[PDB]
DNA sequence: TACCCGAATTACCCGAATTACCCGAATTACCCGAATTACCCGAATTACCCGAATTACCCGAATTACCCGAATTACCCGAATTACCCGAATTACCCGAAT
DNA sequence: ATTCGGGTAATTCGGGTAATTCGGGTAATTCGGGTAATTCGGGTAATTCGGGTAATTCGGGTAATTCGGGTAATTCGGGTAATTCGGGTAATTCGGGTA
């Protein structure tokens, strides 16, 4: 799978990482976790979101 | 693509954000919703409009 | 990279002139205009403040 | 056993190989040194941590 | 003594057979010669080196 | 005169019974044929060549 | 003396690194000379044997 | 009548004398006991059986 | 009385001249002494034993 | 007229070489009777006796 | 004198008549021929000889 | 220039939801020289695909080997007896004629 | 029938070495029976031999990945402010005309 860092995600949405987080822990964004406990998101679904395909 | 928040698109027209909405609500300005509903506009599309190129 | 604009009434007030007389100055092109998506104009601030000092 | 290079382990998590290494040095991952020094990882173990199965 | 082909050793270390042969020339590993020149390596020691025993 | 069947001889070199039959037919190994034709090789001959003593 | 030195299948077998049963078939194939003991066992001319190991039909 | 000792037969057939004795006892061979009891054998007979001539 | 020498009796049974003597002293054979010491043996008696009739 | 035996005859009785029977007589184990020529002759009774072992 | 025929001389000496006739002819035995030629030998000369007194 | 009139577009008030920016702790991204590993490339040594042939191997049955203490038999030996060895002289045995 | 008489071949003198033999003693052999390995019949499964093509590994080189370690940038966390959402009513602007 191809992952995005929160920084990258936040950018495509013109939003703040702390939001993508609240977005993810609010269950709107499937998240993976780094062994260090940092999040990572599935590009495919991020894109699918921007293009507005629920 | 580089986006602008309504607060920004508004300041580029000396116009209230709430009007920037109407524009997008009538399809005069492509919009991109964040997961929360808040809109967000394509910097490209705005610059081209300040120049006056119908889209 | 952003042009500061003025609302017509904002420009009018700056000349003790009426808004509908700014439109004239616009449709006669002594003043640069930028249209909103609705149709209403807005004017380049650096431009008017220049006319005040009298600098064509 | 099938193995992974620190290049690959990092690519899967979207992380720097200089960090996958810090992971092993902290014990969060099984390392297997080559005769030269380079590390190497167990594919199973890694793909287990993506799904988050500690 | 049981033996492995350089390819085999490579697969085990997730490393190029070329590299296994570099290891050989550098004494990091015992080689054994076929009457055609091909190196064969003692399973005993490679298996121990994975483990981490010089 | 103790000997080794090609099977055995090749299991010591990590090689195919074909390649042994090459070495003999090429002249790097003393061969001894049976009434049937199957080759068979001087026992020591081999182990010697295992250390590097032609 | 007037006596052919003989070998037992086991012994011949050892020399060729081969199973008795195989030598015992080299016999019934006329590739070798068989001498039957009064009981049935084959014995082989040590002379004939040693020869073939050098490649001399 | 040129005779052979049991060992002599044995040495000819590549066999242990106990077997040559076992033969004369199984009747497959003419035995000639000495005054003491030890078996002796007729050379001709032995020579034949080597060739392959039953008798 | 046709007579046999010990060397004669011996070659007949495939035995040693000495043994034939031991046979004589054991009374298994009628010996007849020369005027010197040597013994002779009655052929009738000897031929009869090789057959199998005491 | 004693019944007489020639050396060849005595010899043949003992399975011996005549040349030896002479040594018997030349030594005294036997009675010799010389012919005019020189040859010896032997007393049959005497010989016939020594066969049974009668000194 | 008392006389013996050549046979009677022969038989006594265990010898063939011709020998007697040769003993006589030689001059070792006194003979006296009949009218017809056949010889006769002195019985008392003969016996003196079997004993052996020249 | 104003100020005149429909039609339109734009600027506020709001309550509820969303998202920005604040502290510090913790994880992570590239920094660098130095070493290790991946590929790029021809002559050569290996690894399997193939059918005919040889060898290895599985089976109950019979034959062959080697266990033992007792008995008989083969040599090691020194001294006497006996076998053949040489020429020359003695004996037997082969033919007619007579006794 | 024997002898005379007369010419061989076989025997027996004479004397001297090899060869047997006698007499007694010790290691090798055969004797009388029992138990485990080897061969004995034929048949199936596995190895090898003859030759042919592709993948590997032998020879040496430059670029990339990784290593050891050390600051900045980011991302963990919560916790108010400020934007934005969605709906509603007046203010401004748009398009022209006359004093």
Residue numbers in the entry:
A (entry chain D), D (entry chain C), E (entry chain L), F (entry chain K), I (entry chain G), K (entry chain A): 9 to 62
B (entry chain O), H (entry chain H): 9 to 63
C (entry chain P): 7 to 62
G (entry chain Y): 6 to 62
J (entry chain B): 8 to 62
Reproduce, without paraphrasing, sentences from the article in which this PDB structure was first reported.
Like BldD and BldO, BldC acts as a repressor to sustain vegetative growth, and so deletion of bldC causes the premature onset of sporulation. bldC encodes a 68-residue protein that is predicted to contain a winged helix-turn-helix (wHTH) motif, suggesting it may be involved in DNA binding. While BldC appears to contain a MerR-like wHTH, it is to date, the only known MerR-like protein that consists entirely of a wHTH with no obvious effector or oligomerization domain. Using a battery of structural, biochemical, and in vivo approaches, we show here that BldC functions as a pleotropic regulator of Streptomyces development by employing a unique mode of DNA binding for a transcription factor that involves asymmetric head-to-tail oligomerization on DNA direct repeats of varying number with concomitant distortion of the DNA.
To deduce the molecular basis for this extended binding we next determined the structure of BldC in complex with an 18mer smeA-ssfA DNA fragment that contained the first two repeats of the smeA-ssfA BldC binding site, 5′-GCAATTCGGTCGAATTTC-3′. The DNA was constructed to generate pseudo-continuous packing of the DNA, which was indeed generated in the crystals. The structure was solved by molecular replacement (MR) and refined to Rwork/Rfree values of 20.9%/27.8% to 3.09 Å resolution. The structure reveals a striking extended protein-nucleic acid filament with multiple BldC subunits arranged in the same head-tail manner as observed in the BldC-whiI opt structure. Indeed, due to the continuous stacking of the DNA, it was possible that the 9 bp sites bound by each BldC subunit are statistically disordered (half of the time containing one 9 bp sequence and the other half, the other 9 bp sequence). To address the possibility that the DNA may be statistically disordered, X-ray intensity data were collected on a crystal grown with DNA containing a thymine to 5-iododeoxyuracil substitution (5′-GTAAXTCGGTCGAATTTC-3′, where X is 5-iododeoxyuracil). An electron density difference map revealed no strong electron density peaks for the iodine indicating that the DNA is statistically disordered. This superstructure results in a continuous electropositive patch that tracks along the length of the DNA.
